Structure formats: C-alpha cells, structure tokens
C-alpha cells in the first residue's frame, strides 16, 4: 500500500468510482420522496436526474483538461466538494429550480471524479489499459449496491433531507480524502499525442462516437425494457428480483473480463465481437426470454454482459489512439455520447414498448447494438491511424 | 379514471359440470395489465384460482390446475374464467382482480370486483 | 412440500379502539419481501392494504404499516379504530403457486 505501487492506484480509483457511482444508482429510492414535497414525479425529479446527467458532457472534458495539465489532485478536490455542495441539501430544497441547480452541481463533480479515476488507471497502467478501466468502470457500476438497503431504511425512517445530507457528507468527504493521496507516474507533446481540437478533426473519434452513442441509447432501453418484460410474461416476483441482481452484477462483472479480453487481441475486433453478440441476444431478448425463469435470467446475464463492456473498451480505446498525454480532456468528450443520450431516455423505453410491442422495442435495441458493430466490424478498421490535420502553434 | 370490475355468470350448477364466469373491466387495458381469478371458500378462505398475464401467458395452481382456463378478450375487455369437472370443494365466490402494471411493482390482486358466487352441491 | 403455506397464528383477537395491534404471518419457506396484506370487511371484497411487506397504497391510512422480511412478517394497526375491524390476510407472491393465510379476524373484547 505504498506510494508509487500503480495497484495502490487503481485501488484509489476503483473507491472513487464507487463513491460517485451513489448520484446515478441511488436515484431510484430518492425519487418518489423528493417529489413527494414538490409537483409532478415525471417532470420534476426526472428533469434535475436529466440536467445532472447532460451536464457531464461539459463536465468532464474541462476536468479532464485541468488533469492533463495540473495533475489530479485539485481537480479531484473541486469534483469531491461540487458532488458535497450538490447531493448533501437536495432533501432541504424547497424549490423545483434549486433541486435542478444543485443536481447538476453534483453530477458535475461525479463526472469530474469518473474521468479522473478513468485517466489515473489508464495512465498508470498503459499496459493493462483495457482492464484497469473495467475495474474502474465495473467500481462504478457496483458501488452503491451493498448498502442499497441500508439508505433504503434511512430514508424510511429517518427521512429524506437526513439521506441527501449523510450520502452527500459521506461521498464528498471519501472523494477529497482520496484526492490528497492520488498522484500521476510523472508536457512532452508526441506525434500521435493529438489535443481534443485536432481529435475533433479525425473521423475515426467520429467513428467511436456514434458507436458509443448507439450503445448507450439502445442500454437505456435494454435496462428500461428488460425486467418490465419479465414482469409482462407473468414471472414470480423472486424471479424478478433475482433478474435485477443478475442485469446489475453482470454489467459491473463484464467490465473487467472485457478489458482483459480486449489487451490481449485488441479494441476493433473485441468491440466488434462484443457488439454482435450483444445485437443478437438483444434480437433474440422476447423470443428467448418466454422458455420461462431460467431463459429470462441466462438472456438477461448474456445482454448485461455483452453490453456492459463498452465502458472498459472506449477509455482505452482513446488512450491507444488519441494520446495519453490529452486523454483526459478526449476521454470526457467520449463522456459527451453517454450525457447526450440520456436526452431521450426519459420514458422513451416505455413508450416505444407500449406503442409498437415489446418485440419491436428489443429489435431497435438490437439494432442500435447492431449499428455499434457494423461501425466497430466495418467501418473504423479501414481508416487506421488518424491524421492530425489542421495544426495550430 | 376509475377502475370498473364486474363479476357474473355464477349460478347453482350440479357437480362434474361446466360453467363461464365473466369479468367485465373498465378504466384500463387488458395488454399492460395483468388480471387474475381468486375464489373465497364458504369457509372464508381464499385460494388463488388462475392468473393471465400481460402476454396472455396462464398460471394455475396444481390444485385446480387443467380443469379450468382462464382467458380474456382484448376487444370487448372481459375475462374470461372457464369451468369443467366441478367438484365439492370448487363451490366459492369468484372474484376477478387486476395485477400490477407492467413497469411497476405491486401485488397480484391490486383491486377487486363485487364477486360472482358458483357452488355445486346437493 | 413444494408449495409455501403461510400461517397466521392467531385466528381470533381482541383488541380496544385506540390501541396497538399486530398481525404476524409465519412463512413455511423464504420470500424474502414479496408479501402483501389485505382486509376483508364482513360484506365485502377484500381491499388492498400493502405491497411489498413494506408498503402501503395511496388512500391507505396511516395506520396500518408493514414490516419484516424472510419468514417472519407483521401487519401493525396503531391507534385502531372501529372500521378497523375486519380480517386480516397475508399473500406471497415470491413464488408460484401463490398462497394466502388462515385470516385474523379484528373484534372488540366481550
């Protein structure tokens, strides 16, 4: 546990991922309260989780530029205190544009914290790329799950204003903690170092991006549509719950596994590998999942599993291709997909699925992961390395 | 806004004989609702008959389980409860209740009808 | 056996208005907090109560709460009132078939 051992970091990471990862995964229990002394549910609270979910995508880049240039640890300091000031008083908020204001502040700062955890496991492990980022990213994904029922009996008991405040005191504490000790290996601009400006000029990041974009927009749907289904075909409740765990675990789990996977082949034919499996199993989500219980666990583990790697395969993806040096800022901009699409995502699964059938929903699901492959398998191979056009001193 | 459910078809049938209870539902769709079929012994205690889903997928406990058959018809809003091979123990009043719906969690039987009474004895 | 069975111990009790009363519901195997609560009136069909061992509906009064998880769950009525006074029966809906329990009928003391 000593300074300078890259597992000491990636540890570091790995808790910050799991500190920030309360503001998206926490929402859930949080949401009916906090409407309950305000207006309308889907307007309101969905609105201040929208905003604290776009405004990531100007979030991130400017911390991951504050990285690449000072290092991480002041800017981890401002995401750990914005995610304080923003999370603690949103159960002491008595006005609708408040609770706006300071979701987005907390947002702000986690997707500040995720692009610093993003950037320190893969500049501390530029070899391990694929899997230091799973390890972050399945840190993100799993970290409010252990103590989802304690804040659960919080909030029934002690109510909501005391929840926001002890989440809020607890995370922005942890975070700035963590960002005393947090350092880098070591700016030495290279060849292939491109900045986020020149990135923005190569069709390959263009390429990646509308893939990213794709498979996020088709996730929100597959999470939004998956256990509703189950619950459509007449399961048991138990059997549901265990398919809640099952998507949850699974996407946290297939992280890792992916990032190893894509070290030892590559980006390109593990994204492609991953995207197609990923379609077909969503194509064959309704058909499958009727054989009963088991089915709809095995298909729900296999989609989680096949799309949940994207968030391990994308970082080191752009530290490969784009430089390491501005892969902070690039990184964010990347972010900028996964901000965009939660745009929509509102009731948009829901309203597909009751508009034109659940099978039709899992087929346009399974196309957006369909267009992700096509575009990994088909199109950015063949463009190989990006240019670097249009150089400015 | 409200939700309508009205049982009938309850009669006094003699025994190893067929009988169809209708629920006539009003206020909400058969498709993202589910709907189930629960009788009440004379004896005040209640057994879970059958329960389509929103799929139209049927369960029925193995106590009752293939002689009767719950359905329902999407155009007209009724369900629909067939009975056959009636024994002693099926005489109970039916009632016809809406499970949750499809994107949020809630019991089997949210609301209830009036009830239907079937008994088949002496 | 495969199939849950639900026991309510107390068949009949007594209570007082303004008092504090507690159904229990004793399940043969575990389901976790898929336990609902209803109440039957002597001339009518049962009305739902609470969802989830846990929760209760909009419209429901704050009287009645729930709680518990596993095999052990119990229906609390603080402050009972004379509507109150009704039977009382515990579902799971964890696994199929679903079952439902002996019933606790609510009257004053003789």
């Known amino acids: 546990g000593l300074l300078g051992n890259r597992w000491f970091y990636l540890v570091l990471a790995v808790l910050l991922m799991c500190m920030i990862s309360g503001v998206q995964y926490s929402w859930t229990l949080y949401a009916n309260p906090v409407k309950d002394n305000l207006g309308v549910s889907l307007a309101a609270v969905q609105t201040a989780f929208t905003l604290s979910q776009v405004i990531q995508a100007g979030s991130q880049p400017g911390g991951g530029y504050f990285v690449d240039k000072f290092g991480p640890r002041i800017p981890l300091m401002f995401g750990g205190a914005m995610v304080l000031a923003g999370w603690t008083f949103m159960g002491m908020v008595d006005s609708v544009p408040a609770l706006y204001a300071l979701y987005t502040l907390a947002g702000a700062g986690v997707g500040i914290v995720y692009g610093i955890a993003m950037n320190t496991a893969n500049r501390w492990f530029p070899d391990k790329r694929g899997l230091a980022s799973g390890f972050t990213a399945a840190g993100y994904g799993l970290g409010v799950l252990p103590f989802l029922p304690l804040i659960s009996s919080v909030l029934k008991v002690e109510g909501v204003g005391a929840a926001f405040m002890y989440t809020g005191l607890i995370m922005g504490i942890l975070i700035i903690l963590i960002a005393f000790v947090i350092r880098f290996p070591g700016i030495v601009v290279t060849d292939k170092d491109f900045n986020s400006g020149e990135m923005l000029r190569t069709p390959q990041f263009w390429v990646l991006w509308t893939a990213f974009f794709s498979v996020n927009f088709g996730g929100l749907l597959l999470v939004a549509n998956s256990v509703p289904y189950g619950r459509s075909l007449g399961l048991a409740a138990g059997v549901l719950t265990i398919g809640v765990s099952i998507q949850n675990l699974f996407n946290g789990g297939c992280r890792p596994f992916w990032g190893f996977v894509s070290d030892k082949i590559g980006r390109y034919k593990t994204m492609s590998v991953v995207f197609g499996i990923n379609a077909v199993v969503l194509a064959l989500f309704p058909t499958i999942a009727a054989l009963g219980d088991v089915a709809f666990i095995a298909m729900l583990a296999i989609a989680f599993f096949t799309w949940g790697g994207s968030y391990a395969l994308f970082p080191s993806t752009n530290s490969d291709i784009f430089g390491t040096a501005y892969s902070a800022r690039n990184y964010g901009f990347f972010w900028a997909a996964k901000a965009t699409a939660s745009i929509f995502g509102g009731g948009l699964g829901a309203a597909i699925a009751t508009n034109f059938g659940w099978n039709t929903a899992f087929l346009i699901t399974a196309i957006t992961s369909f267009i992700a492959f096509a575009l990994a398998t088909f199109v950015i191979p063949r463009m190989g390395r990006p240019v670097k056009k249009m150089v400015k001193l | 806004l409200e939700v309508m459910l009205v049982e009938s078809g309850g009669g006094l049938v003699k025994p190893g004989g067929s009988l169809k209870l209708s629920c006539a539902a009003s206020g909400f769709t058969f498709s993202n609702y589910a709907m189930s079929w629960v009788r009440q012994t004379p004896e005040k205690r209640l057994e879970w008959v059958a329960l389509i889903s929103s799929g139209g997928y049927t369960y029925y406990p193995d106590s009752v389980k293939g002689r009767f058959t719950i359905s329902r018809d999407k155009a007209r809003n009724i369900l629909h409860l067939q009975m056959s091979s009636l024994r002693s123990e099926d005489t109970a009043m039916y009632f016809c209740?809406?499970?949750?719906?499809?994107?949020?969690?809630?019991?089997?039987?949210?609301?209830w009808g009036q009830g239907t009474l079937v008994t088949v004895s002496a | 056996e495969l199939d849950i069975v639900l026991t309510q111990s107390q068949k009949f009790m007594s209570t007082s208005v303004g008092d504090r009363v507690s159904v229990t519901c004793k399940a043969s195997?575990?389901?976790?907090?898929?336990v609902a609560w209803y109440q039957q009136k002597p001339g009518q069909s049962p009305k739902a109560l609470i969802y989830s061992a846990s929760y209760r509906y909009s419209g429901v009064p704050d009287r009645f709460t729930g709680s518990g998880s596993g095999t052990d769950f119990t229906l609390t009525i603080s402050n009972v009132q004379s509507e109150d006074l009704a039977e009382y029966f515990c579902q799971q809906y964890n696994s199929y078939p679903l079952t439902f329990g002996a019933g606790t009928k609510l009257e004053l003391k003789t």
């Open positions: 209740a809406r499970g949750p719906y499809d994107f949020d969690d809630g019991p089997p039987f949210g609301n």
């Open positions: 195997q575990n389901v976790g907090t898929n």
